[PDB]
Design a protein around this ligand. Structure first.
Ligand SMILES: Cc1cc(/C=C/C#N)cc(C)c1Nc1nc(Nc2ccc(C#N)cc2)nc(OCCCN2CCOCC2)n1
Ligand SMILES: [Mg+2]
Lengths: 400, 537
């Protein structure tokens, strides 16, 4: 009920960030939403004396035809001091985890008077005709880094009865999202989450246990073409940047001479032994792989075709914190960018569940394409960071 | 006296750590001073300014130019805080049966400046012969030339006009620059009526006051165009003149179809100069001649009707140039435009088509708030094959195939698997860096071999050279094994055109081929058939 003093970080001003164009329906929806938000005191119209700006748009989540206001706070977030819960490393070990949107709660608490200027945002007008409708926040804004950190006390004060009632249930909070893990049965779990929803009221489901880290595999064939062996050796040579004792020399020795790619080459005993030892090595985990919380997470994504996508999360190259694959069909089959976007969302969610923060993606796509289309398919309250790779990597064929 | 609603002032602050402007008052002629005294007198009579005392250390220099007083706020604008801020496009506006104009020149000075900031606006008029303290003055209203005056003026005005906007959807209003433009489709009586209503609405705040030339445009009730384009005609061409010419051409390309700016923009590379006499290729002369021939007759865009489809159609102009039209109905264009390829090394038509589509998409969202239906010179099958097999994610919004040559096509397709019965060419190249001396070549399963010596070259160029060689000497189907990640990286991007003539020739070879499998192996692993020993020497 009382505002905690908030400031920026030394040598930094408030964000001035260009608002990108929005469609007619998104603008209409944002108007309808901000009108009521204004009648409720959550936001207030401001003047030209406010130089700053933050981007804004509208999305739609699952099973809902009602729009949601999404503010892109990345810049303002990185200009805030933070440093005001050690990650629940059991959350990834639970049988099931449910994600609830607690963002609404943030609107019950006021924002520091001096800081409000930095929450400024603009509903744009079509064809630059009228100046945009400008607002600044009064209550705590959704998507801001300061919101969960500040509301955290109230959150702890709210969840005490539920937590102390059953201490088998893990509770975590990232931005507007609340992740609740449990080992119970899905029906009783859903009713327990219903209980938590009603419990929260008076004041999407995951399975992290269904995943592990993916090993590198090598083919088992009864006959090898020269091509098959060239590919095998390429892959093993790549793996040797990862694992210590990989040896390709006998396998190569099979290929000596100059041969037709489709010609079948029988494996010698030395070659089969070598390949066996290589399998053995690829079975063991990777050595000295540890998560350093002071370092950025990196996600790489490759398009495998036919709806398949491979990805890796790491910190230092050839040290993989996680590897994965996605075939999922959500109705995105005729659209590559929707698939990519769903993929980025999923990977980010996994990243939040495991390490508690979002990674920085490297996307197989052109900046202009992605930037034009990604808001159309985005269902999440947080926005990660991403770069673009314009030169096709070879690692693609080694992760399939 | 009917009570006037006060225009609420906007709080204004100086940048932190900064003190208000203090700059020496310039010496003047007796005449100029005599003019300034009268001007500032009648201005004080109009409440625009006020006389102040020595208690104000701040001073802003003032000139007089031939009559007209000029206050130079240059040092105040540097010490003044940032304010908030893109003109509309005619193709986005709507047809208006009647358009009435009203003068707002009376209302600009009715916008008051924040009192606590007024002391920073202080300026002094030197008395005759410097024998008295110069008359001291401060602004009570937004000064012409001040940093925040436009933003605050348009903000106040918008705030005023908003209630009689929203209540009258049948009326459209805009302020340019000293004027108020209203428009409607209403019957003339209802139009004049609503004009009177507005006049009264503004009267409340105490404001008692075709074709149109607007921002380089001509606006007509039924349609729009650009104001006439004057391209300087001279046998001598400067750099700044090339910039002006290209600018005007770009400006003209939004309505006039077929405008090509490439040849003239090719000559601006890596040069900062305002003077050079720069020659022109016959390509450039023909280009400018064709632009003069296109500009020879006028064309008009129409306005936007939300009740109709929005359609964008694109054509390939060749040489990285694309041209597009946006229309609701056939032959009546809302507007037109062009797109030129980004500066690449290697590229293909499908990627450029994609980029153009995205550009037009974003532009359309800006102007009309929606994405148009696209008519594209590419077959459904080609787009299918492309996006399915491309290593990158790609998407185009809803579209149809329009058959208007040249068509965009895929010029070659690499195999997914090794080819049976097709000769296998193991290729390689190597170059000694200090001598710049290298070899390129191949060996094959059939015993076919070549090594060609090369002067003035590099490992990458030799690795490309080897592949070119393997393509020259092979039949319509060929397997090729390379160790070059560079080469494979270039070819897996699928260029149909390149800066490099080597890559171009490679492309021609691929085009002539029926089937090509390109395989990669790691170098120096002693993998059979890959011979470093031949080329390295
Ligand atoms: C009056 C006016 C004068 C000038 C310059 C004068 C000088 N000097 C410049 C502008 C920009 C406007 N303002 C305006 N003009 C039109 N049409 C129009 C027709 C004929 C003529 C003539 N002859 C002139 C103008 N239509 C609109 O707005 C409709 C957009 C509605 N939607 C809302 C949803 O999102 C999309 C837009 N505004
Ligand atoms: Mg080589």
């Amino acid at each position: 009920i009382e505002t905690v003093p908030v400031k920026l970080k030394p040598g930094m001003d408030g964000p001035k960030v260009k608002q990108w164009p929005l469609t007619e329906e998104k603008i209409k929806a944002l108007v309808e939403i901000c009108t009521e938000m204004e009648k409720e005191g959550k936001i207030s119209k401001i003047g030209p004396e406010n130089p700053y700006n933050t981007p804004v748009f509208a999305i739609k989540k699952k099973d809902s035809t009602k729009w949601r206001k999404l503010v892109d706070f990345r810049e303002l977030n990185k200009r805030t001091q933070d440093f005001w819960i050690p990650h629940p490393a059991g959350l990834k070990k639970k049988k099931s985890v449910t994600v609830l949107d607690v963002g609404d709660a943030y609107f019950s608490v006021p924002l520091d008077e001096d800081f409000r200027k930095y929450t400024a945002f603009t509903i744009p007008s079509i064809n630059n005709e009228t100046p945009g409708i400008r607002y600044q926040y009064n209550v705590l804004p959704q998507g801001w880094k300061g919101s969960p950190a500040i509301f955290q006390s109230s959150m702890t004060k709210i969840l005490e009865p539920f937590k102390k009632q059953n201490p088998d249930i893990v509770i975590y909070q990232y931005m507007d999202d609340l992740y609740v893990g449990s080992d119970l049965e899905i029906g009783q779990h859903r009713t327990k989450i219903e209980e938590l929803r009603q419990h929260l009221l008076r004041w999407y489901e995951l399975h992290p246990d269904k995943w592990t880290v993916q090993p590198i595999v090598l083919p088992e064939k009864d006959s090898w073409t020269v091509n098959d062996i060239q590919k095998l050796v390429g892959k093993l040579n790549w793996a040797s940047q990862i694992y210590p004792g990989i040896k390709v020399r006998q396998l190569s020795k099979l290929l000596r001479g100059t041969k037709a790619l489709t010609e079948v080459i029988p494996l010698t005993e030395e070659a089969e032994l070598e390949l066996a030892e290589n399998r053995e090595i690829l079975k063991e985990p990777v050595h000295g792989v540890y998560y350093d919380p002071s370092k950025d997470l990196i996600a790489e994504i490759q398009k495998q075709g036919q709806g398949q996508w491979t990805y890796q999360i790491y910190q230092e190259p050839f040290k993989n914190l996680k590897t994965g694959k996605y075939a999922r069909m959500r109705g995105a089959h005729t659209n590559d960018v929707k698939q990519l976007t769903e993929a980025v969302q999923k990977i980010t969610t996994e990243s939040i569940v495991i390490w508690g923060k979002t990674p920085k993606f490297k996307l197989p796509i052109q900046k202009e394409t992605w930037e034009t289309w990604w808001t159309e398919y985005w269902q999440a309250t947080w926005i990660p960071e991403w770069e673009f790779v314009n030169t096709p990597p070879l690692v693609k064929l080694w992760y399939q | 006296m009917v009570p006037i609603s006060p225009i609420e002032t906007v709080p204004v602050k100086l940048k932190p750590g900064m003190d208000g402007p203090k700059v020496k008052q310039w010496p003047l002629t007796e005449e100029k001073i005599k003019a300034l005294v009268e001007i500032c007198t009648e201005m004080e009579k109009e409440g625009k300014i006020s006389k102040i005392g020595p208690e104000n250390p701040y001073n802003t220099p003032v000139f007089a130019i031939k009559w007209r007083k000029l206050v130079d706020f240059r040092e105040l604008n540097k010490r003044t805080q940032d304010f908030w801020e893109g003109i509309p496009h005619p193709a986005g506006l709507k047809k208006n049966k009647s358009v009435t104009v009203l003068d707002v020149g009376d209302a600009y000075f009715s916008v008051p400046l924040d009192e606590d900031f007024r002391k920073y606006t202080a300026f002094t008029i030197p008395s005759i012969n410097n024998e008295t303290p110069g008359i001291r003055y401060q602004y009570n209203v937004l000064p012409q030339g001040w940093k925040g005056s436009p933003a605050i003026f348009q903000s106040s005005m918008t705030k005023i006009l908003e209630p009689f906007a929203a209540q009258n959807p049948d009326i459209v209003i805009c302020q340019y620059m000293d004027d108020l433009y209203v428009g409607s489709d209403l019957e003339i009586g209802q139009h004049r009526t609503k004009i009177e209503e507005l006049r009264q609405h503004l009267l409340r705040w105490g404001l008692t006051t075709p074709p149109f030339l607007w921002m380089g445009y001509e606006l007509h009730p039924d349609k729009w165009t650009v104001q006439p384009i004057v391209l300087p005609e001279k046998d001598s061409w400067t750099v700044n003149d090339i910039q002006k010419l290209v600018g005007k051409l770009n400006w003209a390309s939004q309505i006039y179809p077929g405008i090509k700016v490439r040849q003239l923009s090719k000559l601006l590379r890596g040069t900062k100069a305002l003077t050079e006499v720069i020659p022109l290729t016959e390509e450039a002369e023909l280009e400018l001649a064709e632009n003069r021939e296109i500009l020879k007759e006028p064309v008009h865009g129409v306005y936007y009707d939300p009740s109709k489809d929005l359609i964008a159609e694109i054509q390939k102009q060749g040489q990285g140039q694309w041209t597009y039209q946006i229309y609701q109905e056939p032959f009546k264009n809302l507007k037109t435009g062009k797109y030129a390829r980004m500066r690449g090394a290697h590229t293909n038509d499908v990627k450029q088509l994609t980029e153009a589509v995205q550009k037009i998409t974003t532009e359309s969202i800006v102007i009309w708030g929606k994405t148009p239906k696209f008519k594209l010179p590419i077959q459904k099958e080609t787009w299918e094959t492309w996006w399915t097999e491309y290593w990158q994610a790609t998407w185009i919004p809803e579209w149809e195939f329009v058959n208007t040559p040249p068509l965009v096509k895929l010029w070659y397709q690499l195999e997914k698997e090794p080819i049976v019965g097709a000769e296998t060419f193991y290729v390689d190249g190597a170059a000694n860096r200090e001598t710049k001396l290298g070899k390129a070549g191949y060996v094959t399963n059939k015993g076919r071999q070549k090594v060609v010596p090369l002067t003035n070259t590099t490992n990458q160029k030799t690795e490309l050279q080897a592949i070119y060689l393997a393509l020259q000497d092979s039949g319509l189907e060929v397997n090729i094994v390379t160790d070059s990640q560079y080469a494979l990286g270039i070819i897996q991007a699928q260029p149909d055109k390149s800066e490099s003539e080597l890559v171009n020739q490679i492309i021609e070879q691929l085009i002539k081929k029926e089937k090509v499998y390109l395989a990669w192996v790691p170098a120096h692993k002693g993998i059979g058939g890959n011979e470093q020993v031949d080329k390295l020497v």
